[model samples]
Target: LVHVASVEKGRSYEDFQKVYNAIALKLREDDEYDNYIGYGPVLVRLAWHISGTWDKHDNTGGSYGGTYRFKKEFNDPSNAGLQNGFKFLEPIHKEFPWISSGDLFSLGGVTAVQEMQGPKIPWRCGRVDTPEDTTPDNGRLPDADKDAGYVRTFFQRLNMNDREVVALMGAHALGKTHLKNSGYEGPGGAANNVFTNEFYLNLLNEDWKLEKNDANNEQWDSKSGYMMLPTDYSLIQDPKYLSIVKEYANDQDKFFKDFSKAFEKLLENGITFPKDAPSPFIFKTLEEQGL
Candidate 1:
């Protein structure tokens, strides 16, 4: 209980910015990964998976512990296909061994999003790793086969409301789901590497057909070849979620801002930051710096 933010000893914004640059550079260099989608999407998913295990009731599992590096957490069935992200970060971690696992993992998502032209996710610097025994059991992450009611209830345990849930789900726009990984396959939209409000736009505009994939999982597929998991399609099924989906579909800036906030909140769950803690670091992208 009460995981307080403790800044890495003698490390500040500049140090983390260097880490960000390294991750961003590697992302650009690794262009052939995941069929040219690069490592960006998987990195984002890795960050989310590491942090998504938190339980508000007891706070037993969260990014605060960085337990995903442990075999138990890494091997969770829910974490299938994320090893790519871990491998991508290995070199970065070796170079900046001072950074905590939680910080590195969470910051990978931030760097990927910013480098891919998404919103700036202000990232904090501390997350002391706990022992392997601290890793929470599997089944904490959400299942994609459910509907709006399941989506709403599943996120409640993480303290995410309808708006935050809808906003976070917008990340589906970034990558295609591989059938081998999640039993669902297809790109969520045209720009699979770039962050956009396309998830909402596709959900609202596409004439999706319910069809079973080779994995025998039912998903909504569009004529344009995009796909949405049941939980993704569930957004429009509920009137409350549908309104938020429409709002994000028509507004890009609003979605970006909301997504930035929600994403940071997701990574920061189960940790308390003191008033004296340094402000969240917003690293400049390689493009912005003319790198």
Candidate 2:
């Protein structure tokens, strides 16, 4: 059942490390994005969006397939602003064209997170390019247009439990929703670029009120220039979800560890990783290397 897609020939940790370094360097060099939040958050967004397309039922549309190379997936309206992240990786892809599209895209997120001072996401590479038709049609991604039960039930499709779901959403602290992208606007916090457990803190402590945007969608708006989709706010409003939310908000290390596991699982969804395959790659952040 584990017909692992092949890795690039003659590649080792050093080869992938170079790719990581390139992406990490770009995250620093490309500092003018989204009011200086840089390419990091959007790359994480892109990674999530790409990997989030997985369906456990059929084992289809995952980062494992690397079908994002096709326009059918790339042009999804849900992926509106991810082009920036894609373009950011284009040069890297050209440099290391041997890497599969899935590996490159998913690696972009892994690099973005560590460089942004987020937790290390241990990643594995085996996603091979597939034909365009393998690309899942639009609407597989979670809509910012959702509520508590919807969010809960939505994550169930990805096989995520309450703790995992809340931990993953903590990523909301990284980047803001574009008014044009999800009909929502504003950063989740002041350090929108930095990865923190701020999302949980805000949900537990914010004075968010239901408000309409230019697109006339209902979102919980706060005076802190932070906003939560009804779905994000649902974590605290729901009893079960709220319990996990409070735990993560109160414990930063716990949040980081939980987020790392969930994010890795999210990216690995639907893939049959063989026991014989190499262990997951853990890359160092620039700070770790004194870059």
Candidate 3:
């Protein structure tokens, strides 16, 4: 059990809210990456990967340490293209030096998802920084080329159930899987920047053709120019995942509600919050604040 530092003494909710604002503002500015699709998806992925390292039994690896910014962790091949997300946050970290790296990274995901019209993710501040040696080994993340069974089995190590696995992968609809990034290519939906159940809808409705991408990897492609990795498409092929996919695709509110709960669970893996700790804080969006 490796314990990291918590939020610095004297830090309050309002102070962390300011850090939230800083992350929110930068996400707006770095809106040009991936052909103007923005950094929302990758940032979500970054948070997911950072927190995904937890082994629930021992609690040795997880987002509580915010060590992903360290050289060794950043160099993990599974994190190949995430440097952009890290770089995107560098300036904000410079501006708010008091904020812990773990908190900032996780907050980036929260801001990205909310700003992109996804559900409001309740976040906490207490992840302390750990040294590079504490970085989890690679292969903790699911491979882009895997199938539904593989995806399901892989997430089990992180303690996610079938429904949670389905919802988490739905996030793929938010950003494209770059050939250079994951040996996969193309965005998953028409609107890659906003959060929606469109990934499920597309999986069911799109006239998908089995084709090889520039990376020579197989993916389901549509005439609309969107694509889904074999692993992503498998959600609809398997009976268990298919039912959840259908449910989300048909009910927008249900999708939003489920995704919000699952994503927060994914982000908060391995850390023990006190029983009396405040419920997750749902921050107002930039538009809501008139920014």
Q: For residues 121-149, could you state the per-residue lDDT of candidate 3 as single tens digits?
A: 88877777777787777766778787888
At residue 30, candidate 1 shows an lDDT of 92
* Best candidate, lDDT: 1
**Descending-TM-score candidate ranking:** 1, 2, 3
Alpha-carbon lDDT, every model: 0.95, 0.87, 0.83
lDDT of 2 by residue, 42-109 (tens): 99999998988887777778787788778988899989999899999999999999998889999999
Worst 10 residues of 2 by lDDT: 1-10
Model 2 misses residue 155 by how many Å? 1.2
Every model's TM-score: 0.99, 0.97, 0.95
Best TM-score goes to which candidate? 1
Q: Can you list the residue pairs that collide in candidate 3? A: none
Q: Candidate 1 or 3, higher TM-score?
A: 1
Compute the lDDT of residue 118 as modeled in candidate 2: 89
Residue-level lDDT of model 1, residues 199-219, one tens digit each, is: 999999999999999999999
User: What is the number of residue pairs that collide in model 1?
Assistant: 0
